[PDB]
Amino acid sequence: TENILRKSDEEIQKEITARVKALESMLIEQGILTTSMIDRMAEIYENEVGPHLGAKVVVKAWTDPEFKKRLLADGTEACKELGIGGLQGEDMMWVENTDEVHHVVVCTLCSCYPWPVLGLPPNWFKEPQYRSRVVREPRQLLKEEFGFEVPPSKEIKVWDSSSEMRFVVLPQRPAGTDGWSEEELATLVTRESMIGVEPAKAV
Amino acid sequence: MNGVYDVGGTDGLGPINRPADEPVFRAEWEKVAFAMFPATFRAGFMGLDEFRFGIEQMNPAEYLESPYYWHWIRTYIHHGVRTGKIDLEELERRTQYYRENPDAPLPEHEQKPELIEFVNQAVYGGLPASREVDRPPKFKEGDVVRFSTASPKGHARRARYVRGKTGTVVKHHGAYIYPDTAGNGLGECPEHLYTVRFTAQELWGPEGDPNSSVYYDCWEPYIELV
Ligand SMILES: [Co+2]
Numbered sequence: 404t405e406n407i408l409r410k411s412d413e414e415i416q417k418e419i420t421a422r423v424k425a426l427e428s429m430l431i432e433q434g435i436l437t438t439s440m441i442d443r444m445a446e447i448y449e450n451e452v453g454p455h456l457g458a459k460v461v462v463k464a465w466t467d468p469e470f471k472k473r474l475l476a477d478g479t480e481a482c483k484e485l486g487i488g489g490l491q492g493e494d495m496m497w498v499e500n501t502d503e504v505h506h507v508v509v510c511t512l513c514s515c516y517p518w519p520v521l522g523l524p525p526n527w528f529k530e531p532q533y534r535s536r537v538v539r540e541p542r543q544l545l546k547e548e549f550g551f552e553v554p555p556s557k558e559i560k561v562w563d564s565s566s567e568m569r570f571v572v573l574p575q576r577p578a579g580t581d582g583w584s585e586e587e588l589a590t591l592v593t594r595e596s597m598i599g600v601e602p603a604k605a606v
Numbered sequence: 607m608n609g610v611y612d613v614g615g616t617d618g619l620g621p622i623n624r625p626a627d628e629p630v631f632r633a634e635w636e637k638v639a640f641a642m643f644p645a646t647f648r649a650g651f652m653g654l655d656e657f658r659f660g661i662e663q664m665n666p667a668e669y670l671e672s673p674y675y676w677h678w679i680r681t682y683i684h685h686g687v688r689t690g691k692i693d694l695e696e697l698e699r700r701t702q703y704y705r706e707n708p709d710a711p712l713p714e715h716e717q718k719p720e721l722i723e724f725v726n727q728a729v730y731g732g733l734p735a736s737r738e739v740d741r742p743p744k745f746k747e748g749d750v751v752r753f754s755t756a757s758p759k760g761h762a763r764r765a766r767y768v769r770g771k772t773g774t775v776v777k778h779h780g781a782y783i784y785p786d787t788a789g790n791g792l793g794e795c796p797e798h799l800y801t802v803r804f805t806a807q808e809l810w811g812p813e814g815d816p817n818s819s820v821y822y823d824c825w826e827p828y829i830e831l832v
Contacts, residue, residue: 404620409671416633419676421708423635425700426679429692430642431713435649438712440721441641447729448640449630493732494779496801511614511765513658514674519732523640527624529674535613536622538767538820539810548622559818563614565763566799566823567654567735567782 448523456487457520457571458592460497461603462585465576475499478571482520492519494568498560500575500602505553507545507599508562508570509537515564517571521594528598537561549600572596574603607659607759608766610666615767615810619670632673639675642682644728645721651685654733655789659761660684737796739781744826745800749775751829753802761789768822772832773804776821784825797825 410418430436460482464471474481478495482488488495495517498506510516514529527533536544541559545551553559562570574596580588595601613619631637646652652660660681661669669677686692704710745751755770756762763785779799787795802824806814 406671408667415673418705419673419679420633420635421705422701423638423679424704424708424712425697426642426682426686426692427638428700428704428713429697430645430649431715433649433691434715434718435721436642436645437715437717437721439717440645440725441638443722443725444641444644444729445631445637447725452729489730489732490728491732493734494736494782496777509614511767512612512763513661523630525624526628526674527622530623531613531616531619531670532622535616535619538614539617540815541818542815544622548624555817557817559815560821561818562821563765564823565765566779566825568779568799568801568823570821 448518452489452518453522454520454592454594454597455589456485456522457517457594457597458589459485459585460487460520461573461592461597462588464497464573465588466585471499471573474573478569487519489519491515492517492569495520495571496568497571497573498562499573500599502557502575504558504560505599506560506562506570506572507537507541508564508572509534510564511535511538512563512565515569517569520571521597525594538563545600549595551601572599574599577603577605579606607662607761608757609662611662611664611669612765612767614765636673636675639678643678644725646682646685647728647733648721648724649691651682651689651691653783653788654735655761655783655785656685656791657681658785659789662761735783736779737781737783737794739796739798741798743778743798743800745775745778745798745829745831747775747777750832751775751802751824752832753824754828754830758786760786762786763823763825764828765822767809768804768820771804771808773802773808773822775829776801776803779823782825784827786825786827797827800824800826800829802829 464474474497478497511534516524538561591604596603661677664680752772753768781796782799783794784797804820806818
């Protein structure tokens with residue numbers, strides 16, 4: 404949104420860059436930060452940890468009723484069966500979308516997100532626009548922003564991550580996928596479907 | 607604190623800005639900001655709750671429109687100054703130096719295997735906040751409770767939109783680090799945690815969605831039996 408008081412994006416980036424390099428230089432001198440530590444953290448979240456992990460959990464739940472039960476009972480323990488878990492996903496609670504209920508997650512207080520299964524959150528999830536509105540006008544938000552129309556008669560449950568408990572949505576399995584392999588089913592599971600802002604891919 | 611950052615329910619923030627796709631890190635400075643999280647945590651600058659509080663104390667206008675990772679930088683500086691680990695005057699001098707010489711080198715330093723070990727352990731092992739307490743849970747599933755109207759000036763996880771509102775306990779998760787003490791440098795002081803369900807009508811009145819409910823996590827002191 405326009406703000407006549409705000410500098411250009413270019414000037415903002417230039418200032419931040421200098422401020423971050425300055426702080427970095429100091430933490431490096433303190434011996435608590437190194438170039439390899441920076442590169443390792445970046446590598447993990449750019450190529451190792453991402454939504455493909457959550458997709459694996461979703462497809463297993465879709466194709467294994469017993470695992471699904473365990474997943475809904477204790478998300479952390481269930482995900483550990485697939486070697487999935489860790490930082491910012493120590494406590495996970497998965498919620499199941501059905502014909503009667505639709506779930507959507509948010510961190511109104513900051514940006515809390517299940518890193519182990521979805522990787523780092525997209526910028527819109529961390530921004531004030533989505534965070535402020537989803538708990539108040541979830542139906543309108545889903546329709547206007549994501550083109551996702553949830554019938555008035557269907558309940559929308561919004562989960563606000565105010566604690567360390569991380570909420571993840573288990574989207575409904577799309578129709579016309581009977582007997583599909585886990586690999587094929589995975590192509591329908593998106594980061595958005597696990598946040599609850601969109602359903603899993605149709606067809 | 608009643609900070610602007612507590613945006614749940616706030617009107618007028620505008621439409622969601624959502625590109626079709628985006629990189630995990632939009633610039634090199636973001637990778638640095640991100641990596642400073644485990645670095646400052648290991649160095650004792652702050653714990654998770656304190657980290658959040660530092661961001662909550664930002665200039666609201668700056669918070670609302672600055673790139674996400676800038677919030678992280680602000681909290682590092684805040685706690686660096688608080689603990690006396692960062693000299694503000696030196697930081698300001700170095701900032702100007704890097705403004706004038708953006709391509710100047712970073713300080714010479716030795717790589718440390720222990721820092722890589724810490725990163726791998728934190729990422730794959732996590733930093734669990736669950737704790738065991740001697741007291742049993744005061745509440746249980748089905749209990750109708752009211753959220754506190756207390757308004758601490760320090761850190762807390764009491765979104766203004768749920769204060770004084772009545773809801774139903776959905777699940778008891780066991781005990782966890784208590785933000786009201788931890789975020790204010792007063793220790794873990796673990797408390798039982800519960801997810802509580804609030805109807806949209808309860809939260810927003812007539813303007814609320816007639817078929818919606820919000821689930822919010824409440825530490826034991828936050829709620830009382832109804
Ligand atoms: Co958050």
